[PDB]
Amino acid sequence: QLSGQQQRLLAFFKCCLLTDQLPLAHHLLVVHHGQRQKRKLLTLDMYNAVMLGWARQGAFKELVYVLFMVKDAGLTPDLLSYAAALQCMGRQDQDAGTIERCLEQMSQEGLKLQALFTAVLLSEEDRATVLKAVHKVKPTFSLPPQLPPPVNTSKLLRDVYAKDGRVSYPKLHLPLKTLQCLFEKQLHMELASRVCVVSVEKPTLPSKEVKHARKTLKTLRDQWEKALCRALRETKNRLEREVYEGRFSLYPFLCLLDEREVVRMLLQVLQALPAQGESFTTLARELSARTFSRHVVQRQRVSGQVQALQNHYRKYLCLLASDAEVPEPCLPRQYWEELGAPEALREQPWPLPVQMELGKLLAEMLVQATQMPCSLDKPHRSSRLVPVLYHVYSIGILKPHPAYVQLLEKAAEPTLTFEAVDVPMLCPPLPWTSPHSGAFLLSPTKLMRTVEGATQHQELLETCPPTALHGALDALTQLGNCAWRVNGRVLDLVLQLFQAKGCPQLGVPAPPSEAPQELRRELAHCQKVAREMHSLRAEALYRLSLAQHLRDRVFWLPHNMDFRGRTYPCPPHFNHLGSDVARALLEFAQGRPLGPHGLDWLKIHLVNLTGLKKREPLRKRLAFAEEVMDDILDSADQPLTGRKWWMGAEEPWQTLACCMEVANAVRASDPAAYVSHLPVHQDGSCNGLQHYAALGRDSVGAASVNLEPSDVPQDVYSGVAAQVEVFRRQDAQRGMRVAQVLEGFITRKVVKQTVMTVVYGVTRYGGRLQIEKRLRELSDFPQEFVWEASHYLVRQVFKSLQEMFSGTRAIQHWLTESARLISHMGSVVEWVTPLGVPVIQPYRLDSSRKPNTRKQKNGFPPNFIHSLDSSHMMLTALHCYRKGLTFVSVHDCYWTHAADVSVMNQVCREQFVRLHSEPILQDLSRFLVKRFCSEPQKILEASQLKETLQAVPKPGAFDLEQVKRSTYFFS
DNA sequence: AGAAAACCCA
DNA sequence: TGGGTTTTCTTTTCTCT
RNA sequence: GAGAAAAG
Ligand SMILES: Nc1ncnc2c1ncn2[C@@H]1O[C@H](COP(=O)(O)OP(=O)(O)OP(=O)(O)O)[C@@H](O)[C@H]1O
Numbered sequence A: 001q002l003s004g005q006q007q008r009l010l011a012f013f014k015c016c017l018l019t020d021q022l023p024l025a026h027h028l029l030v031v032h033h034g035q036r037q038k039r040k041l042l043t044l045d046m047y048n049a050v051m052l053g054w055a056r057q058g059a060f061k062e063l064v065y066v067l068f069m070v071k072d073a074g075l076t077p078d079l080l081s082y083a084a085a086l087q088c089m090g091r092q093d094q095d096a097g098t099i100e101r102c103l104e105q106m107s108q109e110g111l112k113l114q115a116l117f118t119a120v121l122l123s124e125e126d127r128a129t130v131l132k133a134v135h136k137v138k139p140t141f142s143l144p145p146q147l148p149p150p151v152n153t154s155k156l157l158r159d160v161y162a163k164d165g166r167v168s169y170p171k172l173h174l175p176l177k178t179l180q181c182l183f184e185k186q187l188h189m190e191l192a193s194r195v196c197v198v199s200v201e202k203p204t205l206p207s208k209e210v211k212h213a214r215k216t217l218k219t220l221r222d223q224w225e226k227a228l229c230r231a232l233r234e235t236k237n238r239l240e241r242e243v244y245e246g247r248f249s250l251y252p253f254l255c256l257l258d259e260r261e262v263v264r265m266l267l268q269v270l271q272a273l274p275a276q277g278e279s280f281t282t283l284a285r286e287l288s289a290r291t292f293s294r295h296v297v298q299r300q301r302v303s304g305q306v307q308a309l310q311n312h313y314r315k316y317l318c319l320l321a322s323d324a325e326v327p328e329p330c331l332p333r334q335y336w337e338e339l340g341a342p343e344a345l346r347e348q349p350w351p352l353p354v355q356m357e358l359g360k361l362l363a364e365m366l367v368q369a370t371q372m373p374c375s376l377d378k379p380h381r382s383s384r385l386v387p388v389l390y391h392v393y394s395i396g397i398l399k400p401h402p403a404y405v406q407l408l409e410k411a412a413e414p415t416l417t418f419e420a421v422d423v424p425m426l427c428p429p430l431p432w433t434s435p436h437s438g439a440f441l442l443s444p445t446k447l448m449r450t451v452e453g454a455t456q457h458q459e460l461l462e463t464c465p466p467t468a469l470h471g472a473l474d475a476l477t478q479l480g481n482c483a484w485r486v487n488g489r490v491l492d493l494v495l496q497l498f499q500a501k502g503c504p505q506l507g508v509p510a511p512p513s514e515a516p517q518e519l520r521r522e523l524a525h526c527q528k529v530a531r532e533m534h535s536l537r538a539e540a541l542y543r544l545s546l547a548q549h550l551r552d553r554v555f556w557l558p559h560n561m562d563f564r565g566r567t568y569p570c571p572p573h574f575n576h577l578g579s580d581v582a583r584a585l586l587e588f589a590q591g592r593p594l595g596p597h598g599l600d601w602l603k604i605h606l607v608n609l610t611g612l613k614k615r616e617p618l619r620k621r622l623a624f625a626e627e628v629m630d631d632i633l634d635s636a637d638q639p640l641t642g643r644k645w646w647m648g649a650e651e652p653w654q655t656l657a658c659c660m661e662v663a664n665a666v667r668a669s670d671p672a673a674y675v676s677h678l679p680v681h682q683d684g685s686c687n688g689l690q691h692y693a694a695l696g697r698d699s700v701g702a703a704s705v706n707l708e709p710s711d712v713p714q715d716v717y718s719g720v721a722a723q724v725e726v727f728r729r730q731d732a733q734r735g736m737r738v739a740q741v742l743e744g745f746i747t748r749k750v751v752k753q754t755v756m757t758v759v760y761g762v763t764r765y766g767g768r769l770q771i772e773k774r775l776r777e778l779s780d781f782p783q784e785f786v787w788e789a790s791h792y793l794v795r796q797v798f799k800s801l802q803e804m805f806s807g808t809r810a811i812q813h814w815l816t817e818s819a820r821l822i823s824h825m826g827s828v829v830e831w832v833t834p835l836g837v838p839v840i841q842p843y844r845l846d847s848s849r850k851p852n853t854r855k856q857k858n859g860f861p862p863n864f865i866h867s868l869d870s871s872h873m874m875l876t877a878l879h880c881y882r883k884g885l886t887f888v889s890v891h892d893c894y895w896t897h898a899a900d901v902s903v904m905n906q907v908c909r910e911q912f913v914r915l916h917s918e919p920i921l922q923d924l925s926r927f928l929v930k931r932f933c934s935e936p937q938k939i940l941e942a943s944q945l946k947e948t949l950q951a952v953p954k955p956g957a958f959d960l961e962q963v964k965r966s967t968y969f970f971s
Numbered sequence B: 001a002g003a004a005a006a007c008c009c010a
Numbered sequence C: 001t002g003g004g005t006t007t008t009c010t011t012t013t014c015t016c017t
Numbered sequence D: 001g002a003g004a005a006a007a008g
């Protein structure tokens, strides 16, 4: 649309506003105004930018100059131009307070002053100055009184937003002053954009070469520090020259940040660089994005937004603190908005070519700025100052000359360095009051996770009724308000294995040592295994370094959504959706007493973690727990020196943590009045099958995946495993070798993924790879036939064909056909969840202007079922919040304290009915016939999709209220 | 690799 | 009708080219 | 970009 130079100079003038430097903008405006080619292609917005800037300084003569320049070249003043004019007229006492010409022309122009105060975004201080100007004269003007905020009136969301009800909202265990101090700590950790952590490695004792290298790097880094402060000042003068000669320049972009912070950034980029050099454009985009983030943090420090955030957060903590009482209790978004919400003043990203030019300029400073001696091993040897990194040609990756990387490797630097946003928050996160504001204090966290800069996700989120997202945001805040701590005993044991030779049986990666050590094939395989082990140990190193950092601290994990609705915590390395070790390290910081029923749920949780007794009732899982109590107590007491019963569990570290918790609870004097911090888990049987069976009301499926009450749990995977094992015997007696070598190897775990995936649009090749990976990890299985057996295991699993999951397949076929026809119409598949969240699919494999019908078709049934179980999770979260339950969730795995597992069940058995009492299939049908089938050009295609959508398959005969008495719906 | 057919563009 | 490409969906981490 | 690994 607009020219690239227009956006480029718009970014220039905006950054000149943000960095004082206003005579530079006036000079460039004058130079462009002189030349006829240059005075063309300016929009009104750049003169408007210089308008508000001279309004901030209040220079009346200069602003009258640029206002006179507005009328030339056919630009009439817009609303905000008049606003800045009112701001400068009121900044002085001119025109008897701005009415003598400005307000008369304001009324003559036909631009509404109400529309100025409402429609057009203004700064709050500028808005107050306009108020003072238009209050010196005309005192009969007053601001329109803003209404009380709207309260959502949907059927599922009536109960959570009904004012008259008995509520018990949970409060944190931390007082107001402690939470305020943690707010200060988080603010300091976010202003300093990186955090340094100690390695969990074994440290190296002082040696001659190690400390010689250690003092060599300090001298070289200080030398490059002075070199970088030379180069950036030289290019600052050189770019100010281009400003003063009438050229575009990046001079305010380098004055966005101080000299020091840029040099520190470039040094941290060298410290974080691997032995192999990274792509030049990737280094550029990383550097310029870091410049943007540090600018966003710096602008709030200068502009006074940080102090406003301080006062509001100190008032907001009264809701969460144990020692403070809000007069009427309410939700954190509601209490945030009831208090005066600060203006966001959203920093917007610059145009992408300007970002790339900044990254190129910084990286090309970094290339020709740093130098080092070549004679590293011999300091007395005379060597010229060899460039440390010239590989710009090369796909283009810079070269770390091997002296530097060997110097680092013999330096034994004990410190890793993280981003602020890659670390758990030290204070409770900001409430999700908007798709813009939430999670981190000073960083623009996104509502939906996305890649490659897909922006239609937000464009659906900001085009909604304002009360639609209220259910989702209050869910994410509830997921973010969970207080976590680190289980230190598990950390001690894992670091004991990590600092020694690792234990790959229990998940601790092996060192570069104990690696495997005609000939070429074996050497290549040894190098491959060495690289994989080194990579896994680097991952575990980073995770355990954050865990040891947060060992003594209470931290919060802010949550985002994806597009389809499911919720993930923002800090990546150490979260509760990670592996066995990561879940074993994490624990609830707030603890709730067990009560009369908590210890039974702890024991059932332990038996669920062992992986034994999956086919059993709860009474016999509990009887198993009493059977193996001595093994539990020995595993808790002697993990690595006892009989190691916990190691044989399917999730050994979580089993060990639960063994410790159960051992503390049993040996307690009153196990009912024991404060338990362990998250007890409840999981759906087959949630794709659960939601398909509840949509189709299929009695056979509902009985099959436990929507109908039964004494014993029912698994589809154990059914199909025996149903293919009978043919494994029947073909083995015909003398087939592939059936003969699979004896004792047809389990739930090898067919679990395939029968999980049959309800989605799976092909036989994907099922083949699915069983193939599981057969590769089978050590007892001979590895020769792993390919062949995989084919034999996607054959004979046609047992799902014989009228198995029938209404499931009808629902699947209609969703698949709907996605196919929507995409063949040319449109992307969108739908609104029953809680109101709009969902769009970012597939678009044109290059991105057509929808990829294969990807849309294969994506619609999983994305829709994930939307439903995310909505079910959010309803369960909200109605547990009304009953004072601490709830988190790994994507159908609902986690809470043991004392709440009954209540969490009941809400899970209520909001599954209340969600599925609504005609989700019919509401989806009418939404997609209104949104997608109302076009004039494609009446026949709309008729075909109309016949498809209006032929939603009929519900079966299953009363959903039975789910209320289903014991093993979630177990 | 390879056992593998269906969909999309010629 | 003939030839090329994918293979159910999402999320996350690490070192080597 | 491949080498892997993890969660639903
Ligand atoms: N590989 C996968 N592909 C698609 N969806 C998946 C996949 N793995 C899990 N899911 C989704 O996650 C949920 C199932 O999680 P989970 O791993 O607990 O499976 P399950 O069928 O409930 O098995 P289990 O018997 O172990 O409880 C469903 O919503 C399902 O759609």
Ligand SMILES: [Mg+2]
Residues within 6 Å of the ligand: A683, A684, A685
């Ligand atoms: Mg499960």
